[PDB]
Design a protein around this ligand. Structure first.
Ligand SMILES: Cc1c(O)c(CN)c(COP(=O)(O)O)c[n+]1C
Ligand SMILES: Cc1c(O)c(CN)c(COP(=O)(O)O)c[n+]1C
Lengths: 396, 396
């Protein structure tokens, strides 16, 4: 049956980790990881999630199935965080949230909900996009198209090329937005361009589907959500896919949310029950632990206080590593302005290096970067900066 | 977009829980729950998983993503438990395991692996089957057919009707087997009939897909696996979908496994990488907590010792509740032999009650049973037995 000729192929960002843990070479550096690392090169458990898991250890009395949409508190915290406490959507009950196995679990659920309950045939993902959005959408049977996004020769957002490539999208087409700055690019848009894109989806009939995996890593938790909140300010309907893997350090617990907005409460509840039947046929009901830890921290000032400082330290670290990188590049002699790496947000940026320049990095210097030129700033530490920069300088 | 006429419908076993928590009525009893309950009517956390989670609390230092297939230890324990320690399959490396979000997450992954990488078009599920197998398989796009299984007027397995309905299955058809006795029926087959069905799938070309969610609840952990191990004794290929929700009391952590067997190592690894690409496009990588708790208990004699006694007490409880039920039925005067409820294994049996008789139970006596006549023996306690039996007796 699988009796031969069952095919094979590898994940573009993950497969690199294998010939990372494979090298003897001392200075060896893994960039193009997905996760945050501290100054030690460890991805530590947050103190707040350790405190939260101790609470949970003493207080859980059962391990009985969660509802198909998960933990109630979690969903409300997820909407408080994505849309605000003073918020029409939460208020008017036009948003329903399903806790999901990670932000990627939420996109498959958006995708399957969409494929069988609507007329949506295409979904539009930026070029470039996180590689896996495409597979999520194709596995639901939706076909995936690509709108322009990244400049390249200016290292910015090509706003004109974005708009002018998206016009080709017809009305019931889904367009995927990166709310909290973009993987792999690090680029935004500005609030004005978010407003401009929110406008041009209202009059042109597109359905927004936000992917929101790095809330609290660009400017700040709430500042990051202006984009989503510009679109929700004027969309009758939208889907958000959020993850708590990054900002809570809760990666292997698979914590995420799939929020649906639908015009009014009644509609959102009829649509969200088909969202719940898509989940039920998939993984049945979500994993309690990580989400139980998220609902406890956020629903406790003591613990949310420490978490936010923990998030402010993660974010602060990456910002001085984006600054120490551009700077040790200047310092070890670079022939190019890498200062675009500043106002580029989050862990990732395309460094402008070519396929050739990347392979040359891994082979010659032990600096593993995702084959596209994307590097993870959080995998950089103040003791890394000089081996790192030296290598890049050698190559250009 | 969801702007109306987006449809709706409810889950046949779950929707009952809502007008369960909705009644004032004192004696109120919820049967047709899925989970185990102790003599108190609580679904307690196992001592062993509390000890295991304390270990984990002190020893985890990171919450970094698990591989797409999960925790290595977990997968080997899952194969030690499903096929044995002295086992050709594990030995010859012809079995690969993906930790999955619950046994239902494993069936969707089997289903999606099958739909896009093979010629499988139909899958055959017993009539009756756990309601949700069908939706799992239809959402993958496979069409679902039903083979005969349950007698009704003898309250047993109709073996002739099973075999003679399955002949209609062509060679690349998948047939779903319940390894560890059957949901909703409680019926088996015998080792001889397992041997007989394993035989008749070898010469007839069917692909076995086992659903294994109640290991250690029928006879014992290992005794329960004779069926799976009769089929694996002679199948080049098979898929197992197992869950640790029941036997570990780990329901909301979503712990499961999807095992693939493929003739030889090379094949199983080419097939399992397409299994991993199906997972990657679904939920990306599985939840650590519950599986981390399963790998710790099973990979520690002290803790596995206490767990097994905990499993032997769960199983022992249900066996005396199947016996106290048939007995208080005899005692409160029953007009019918309910002794078929003995050798019927697990928590569930069809009691032989009609749709009419069930609605009459909930409305008149506050005894919620799944509309099909299926009742969960573990939701019965020694203080329940008399309200319970009285009600059923009143109705027949
Ligand atoms: C846009 C997006 C990106 O870029 C990622 C990055 N790995 C993720 C990850 O999903 P998670 O479930 O948090 O691992 C999700 N989403 C929705
Ligand atoms: C056959 C089977 C049944 O009957 C059930 C019962 N709920 C499950 C449950 O999946 P889980 O993921 O353990 O909740 C799975 N499987 C595979």
């Amino acid at each position: 049956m699988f009796e031969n000729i069952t095919a094979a192929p590898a994940d573009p960002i993950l497969g690199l980790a294998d010939l990372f843990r494979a090298d003897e070479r001392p200075g060896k550096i893994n960039l193009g990881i997905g996760v945050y690392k501290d100054e030690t090169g460890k991805t530590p458990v947050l103190t707040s999630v350790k405190k939260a898991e101790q609470y949970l250890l003493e207080n859980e009395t059962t391990k009985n199935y969660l509802g198909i949409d998960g933990i109630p508190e979690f969903g409300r915290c997820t909407q408080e965080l994505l849309f605000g406490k003073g918020s029409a959507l939460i208020n008017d009950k036009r948003a329903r949230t399903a806790q999901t196995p990670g932000g990627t679990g939420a996109l498959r659920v958006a995708a399957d909900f969409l494929a069988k309950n609507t007329s949506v045939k295409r979904v539009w993902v930026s070029n470039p996009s996180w590689p896996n959005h495409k597979s999520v959408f194709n596995s639901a049977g939706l076909e995936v198209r690509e709108y322009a996004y990244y400049d390249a020769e200016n290292h910015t957002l090509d706003f004109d090329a974005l708009i002018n490539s998206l016009n080709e999208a017809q009305a019931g087409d889904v367009v995927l937005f990166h709310g909290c700055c973009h993987n792999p690019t690090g680029i935004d848009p500005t609030l004005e361009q978010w407003q401009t894109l929110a406008q041009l989806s209202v009059e042109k009939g597109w359905l927004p589907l936000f992917a929101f995996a790095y809330q609290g890593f660009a400017r700040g938790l709430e500042e990051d959500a202006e984009g989503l909140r510009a679109f929700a300010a004027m969309h009758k309907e939208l889907i958000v896919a959020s993850s708590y893997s990054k900002n809570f350090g809760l990666y292997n617990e698979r914590v995420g949310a799939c929020t649906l907005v639908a015009a009014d409460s009644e509609t959102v509840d009829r649509a969200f029950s088909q969202m719940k039947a898509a989940i039920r046929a998939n993984y049945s009901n979500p994993p309690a632990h990580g989400a139980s830890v998220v609902a406890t921290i956020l629903s406790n000032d003591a613990l949310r206080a420490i978490w936010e400082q923990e998030l402010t330290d993660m974010r602060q670290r990456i910002q001085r590593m984006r600054q120490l990188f551009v700077n040790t590049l200047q310092e070890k002699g670079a022939n190019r302005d890498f200062s675009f790496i500043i106002k580029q947000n989050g862990m990732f940026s395309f460094s402008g290096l070519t396929k050739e320049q990347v392979l040359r990095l891994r082979e010659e210097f032990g600096v593993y970067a995702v084959a596209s030129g994307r590097v993870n700033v959080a995998g950089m530490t103040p003791d890394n900066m000089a081996p790192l920069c030296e290598a890049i300088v050698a190559v250009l």
